[PDB]
């Protein structure tokens, strides 16, 4: 595989590899096995995973940091929509929401520094 035809596009390659270091259980690293959950598509309206993130990125689908951030939030939320309030998988999605929530902040500022516009709040 190959990609990164613009300096903004290169940020997303290295950032996706930093979100992959926030899943130490490999729960989101791969797609949910339908062979043990055949009803997943009847309960989840927009299913996603880290392989689909990578494939979309290698297919030039992400031209703004907002969509790359929002599809990570979608992957977190799709766990929380199909689990019980006491499982490993539930708390693994809470772990991504916190730890990789920082990864999207530290990496957005590499685009904002060259996108220009206003500052502070």
């Amino acid at each position: 595989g190959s990609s990164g035809s613009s300096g903004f596009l290169i940020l997303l390659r290295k950032t996706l590899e930093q979100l992959q270091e926030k899943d130490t259980g490999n729960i989101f690293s791969e797609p949910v096995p339908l062979s043990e959950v055949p009803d997943y598509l009847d309960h989840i309206k927009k299913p996603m995973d880290f392989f689909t993130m990578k494939q979309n990125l290698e297919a030039y689908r992400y031209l703004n940091f907002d969509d790359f951030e929002e599809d990570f939030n979608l992957i977190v939320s799709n766990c929380l929509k199909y689990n019980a309030k006491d499982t490993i998988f539930y708390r693994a999605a809470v772990r991504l929401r916190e730890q990789g929530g920082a990864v999207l902040r530290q990496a957005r500022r590499q685009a904002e520094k060259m996108g220009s516009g206003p500052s502070s709040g």
């Binding site: 043990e36 959950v37 009803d39 009847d42 309960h43 689990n83 019980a84 499982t87 998988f89 539930y90």
Partner: peptide
């Protein structure tokens, strides 16, 4: 019985 990953509660 059941603890996530099968669409069942109550």
């Amino acid at each position: 019985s059941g603890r996530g990953k099968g669409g069942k509660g109550l």
